[PDB]
Paper text:
Calcineurin (CN) is a Ca2+/calmodulin (CaM)-dependent, serine, threonine-specific protein phosphatase that controls T-cell activation and is critical for numerous cellular functions. The CN complex is composed of a catalytic (CnA) and regulatory (CnB) subunit that binds Ca2+, and is activated by Ca2+–CaM2. Here we report the crystal structures of fungal CN ternary complexes with [name]-[name] from highly clinically relevant human fungal pathogens: A. fumigatus, C. albicans, C. neoformans, and Coccidioides immitis, reflecting the common invasive fungal pathogens, including a mold, yeasts, and a dimorphic endemic fungus.
Mammalian [name]–[name] aligned onto the A. fumigatus X-ray structure with a Cα RMSD of 0.4 Å, highlighting overall structural similarity. Comparison of fungal FKBP12s with hFKBP12 highlighted conformational differences at Lys48-Met50, Glu55, and His88 (Gln48-Gln50, Arg55, and Phe88 in A. fumigatus). X-ray structures of AfFKBP12 and mammalian [name] revealed conformational differences in Phe88/His88 positioning and the associated 80s loop. The side-chain for Met369 inserts itself into the small hydrophobic pocket with Leu365, Thr373, and Trp374 of CnA and Phe88, Pro90, and Val91 of AfFKBP12, and packs against [name]. The CnA Tyr363 forms a direct H-bond with AfFKBP12 Arg43, a key residue in stabilizing interactions with the acidic side-chain of Asp38, which directly contacts [name] O4 and O5. Asn367 makes a H-bond with Pro90 in [name], but this interaction is absent in the mammalian CN-complex due to the P90G substitution in [name] and L186Q substitution in CnA.
Author numbering:
A (entry chain C): -4 to 112
B (entry chain A): 9 to 366
C (entry chain B): 41 to 52, 73 to 105, 110 to 182, 187 to 190
């Protein structure tokens, strides 16, 4: 029951091109839907009808994303299971994320440095 | 405030209503519905006193109603709303104005949607105006547990106060559990129960309390039809609901056994989201009529499902489904988070990073 | 202490570049001297930290966070991740909930009473 990983695991739901992978410092465009372990949604870029953009692997986002997203190919639909340490830790992110929360992100990599899928 | 960047965007209503604005000019003992409709639409708030009055007056009426409501056609049956006030406005435009249309809501007025208290205050206001033509059933979300777990308690404490939340909780306990519409349909939120044999079982329930973790009162709010409803390999009636973590899944022979026992045509329910806003289940062998009807009245559920909503209209001997799409609504940060709490953690990081560069 | 910092001062794509450089410039001249350099850093050595966070949003340095200032500063960090409508709406609602004296603006007292629950170190 005890698994050994850095703090994030990826579940490939739908494959991308299998060629273009986000490298450290690249700008990615992702449609995400974040849920808790109970399955309840706390946030989604779909809610705003606006794909999320950020620089990956530079400490902009949580550690689970900086280590999870580069494992995805351009166009891939996957699910990221993120431990609290790769998430928001014991402090969490009130009033949105409780302390010591395992985060589950449905992520679709739409673009890598303005190269879309 | 004239000095805003995006002036084309309308600002929320700044002030709370006065007594003259609040009370109806035609009936000074009841709230102004047209005013409330517009005030809530513009994200306006009532005073604590006004909001408390609506809930308490609503409680006054609900406490006098039986556990099992009994109403005749015509009627418009509505499913889940879940704080989608701006879709609730579309609902009444499709179903018809409550002043000349008989309604029946199956529950789940709160949580998930960030305009739950607006839905409650307005629906309660309608109940005050039309106590004998508009009826409200209790959903599984109309309790202390789920409202505290999800967003409704947070919404009340944020937009108003804890006194408002406690008023709604008390009011939710007064909400009827079921209804028999036109002596043909059992109307509930969830589904059937192994303890539900006749309609008399519902009538003997003490509904003035929080829903139990198990039992008849629980199942009425939580039970679901099987995923393979109408196509069960076994002849079993019930089975543990692994999805909900409580109550049961009921089957087609289970539904038929109940309907034949109580001389009812169908079971009109909600509780489950449908892509078309509704789902018609397998027809009975006795009457050839759909044994179960799921009605869902929350379009584009959680702003992501992109589903249609629907209401059931039954008039004379005619019945039909009316669908409608979602309506744009103002944006809230998750859990009513303010932009200061929302941005400060990121600001602290960028300042810290800028410090290192020096 | 100050002698070491004075040595570092003599030796000397962030979205909050224009803002932070304007905070150090306390007279609004356009430059920054040692006294402005030390004073800016001294806040990171709980009240003074919150006072600095307030200056991030307060562009004209009038002591109040206006609706327009709040939108502009937020847009620097958010970018396209929120639509103009979506951001303007949560900006409007934040002001109303924080504007206890109803002047359309946000004082420092109103700001702290909003984020009493909530970060910057050296
Ligand atoms: C002026 C606005 C600020 C700016 C806000 C935006 C650009 C809007 C953008 C859609 C964020 C959402 O706003 C609606 C909202 O998304 C969440 O709901 C969410 O699903 C989430 O977890 N996401 C979002 C998707 C990427 C992963 C993760 C995240 O890494 O988000 C990042 C995050 C919070 C990192 C913190 C930073 C502080 C550190 O101390 C902490 O370290 C532990 C980690 C976000 C993107 C920051 O990089 C950028 C910002 O903060 C958060 C629960 C709270 C977050 O609002 C802040
Ligand atoms: Ca200067
Ligand atoms: Ca100002
Ligand atoms: Ca003020
Ligand atoms: Fe529901
Ligand atoms: Zn339900």
């Amino acid at each position: 029951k005890i698994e050994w990983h850095e703090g994030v695991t990826k579940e490939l739901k739908s494959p991308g091109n299998g060629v273009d992978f986000p490298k450290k410092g690249d700008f990615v465009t992702i449609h995400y839907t974040g849920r808790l372990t109970d399955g309840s949604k706390f946030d989604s870029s779909v809610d705003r009808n606006e794909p999320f953009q950020t620089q990956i692997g530079t400490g902009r986002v949580i550690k689970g994303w900086d280590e999870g997203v580069p494992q995805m190919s351009l166009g891939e639909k996957a699910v990221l299971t993120i431990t609290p340490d790769y998430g928001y830790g014991a402090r969490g992110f009130p009033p949105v994320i409780p302390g010591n929360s395992t985060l589950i992100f449905e992520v679709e990599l739409l673009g890598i440095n303005n190269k879309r899928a | 405030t004239l000095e805003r960047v995006i002036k084309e965007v309308q600002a929320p209503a700044l002030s709370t209503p006065t007594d003259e604005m609040f009370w109806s000019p035609e009936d000074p003992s009841k709230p102004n519905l047209q005013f409330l409709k517009q005030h809530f639409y513009r994200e306006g708030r009532l005073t604590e006193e006004q909001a408390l009055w609506i809930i308490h007056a609503g409680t006054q009426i609900l406490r006098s109603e039986p556990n099992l409501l009994e109403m005749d056609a015509p009627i418009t049956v509505c499913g889940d709303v879940h704080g989608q006030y701006y879709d609730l406005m579309k609902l009444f435009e499709v179903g018809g104005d409550p002043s000349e249309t008989r309604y029946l809501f199956l529950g789940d007025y709160v949580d998930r949607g960030y305009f739950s208290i607006e839905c409650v205050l307005y629906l309660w206001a309608l109940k005050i105006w039309y106590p004998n033509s508009l009826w409200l059933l209790r959903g599984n979300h109309e309790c202390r547990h789920l409202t505290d777990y999800f967003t409704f308690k947070l919404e009340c404490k944020h937009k108003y106060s804890e006194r408002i939340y406690e008023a709604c909780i008390e009011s939710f306990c007064a909400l009827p559990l079921a209804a028999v519409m036109n002596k043909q349909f059992l109307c509930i939120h969830g589904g059937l129960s192994p303890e539900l044999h006749t309609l008399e079982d519902i009538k003997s329930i003490d509904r003035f309390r929080e829903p139990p973790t198990h039992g008849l009162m629980c199942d009425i709010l939580w039970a679901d039809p099987l995923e393979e409803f109408g196509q069960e390999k076994t002849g079993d009636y019930f089975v543990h609901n692994s999805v909900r973590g409580c109550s049961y899944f009921f089957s087609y022979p289970a539904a038929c056994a109940f309907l034949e026992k109580n001389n009812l045509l169908s079971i009109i329910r909600a509780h489950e989201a449908q892509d078309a806003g509704y789902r018609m289940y397998r027809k009975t062998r006795t009457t050839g009529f759909p044994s179960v009807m799921t009605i869902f009245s929350a379009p584009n559920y959680l702003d992501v499902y992109n589903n249609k909503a629907a209401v059931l209209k039954y008039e004379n001997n005619v019945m039909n489904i009316r669908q409608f799409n979602c309506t744009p609504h103002p944006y809230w940060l998750p859990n009513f988070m303010d932009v200061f709490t929302w941005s400060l953690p990121f600001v602290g990081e960028k300042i810290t990073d800028m410090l290192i560069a020096i | 202490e100050v002698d070491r910092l004075r040595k570092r001062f003599m030796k000397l794509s962030n979205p909050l570049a224009t803002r932070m450089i304007a905070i150090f410039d306390e007279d609004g001249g356009g430059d920054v001297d040692f006294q402005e350099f030390v004073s800016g850093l001294s806040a990171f050595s709980k009240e003074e930290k919150l006072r600095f966070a307030f200056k991030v949003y307060d562009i004209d340095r009038d002591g109040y966070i206006s609706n327009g200032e709040l939108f502009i500063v937020l847009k620097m960090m958010v970018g396209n991740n929120l639509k103009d409508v979506q951001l303007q709406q949560i900006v409007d609602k934040t002001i109303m909930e924080a504007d206890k004296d109803r002047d359309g603006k946000i004082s420092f007292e109103e700001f702290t009473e909003m984020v009493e629950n909530t970060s910057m170190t050296l």
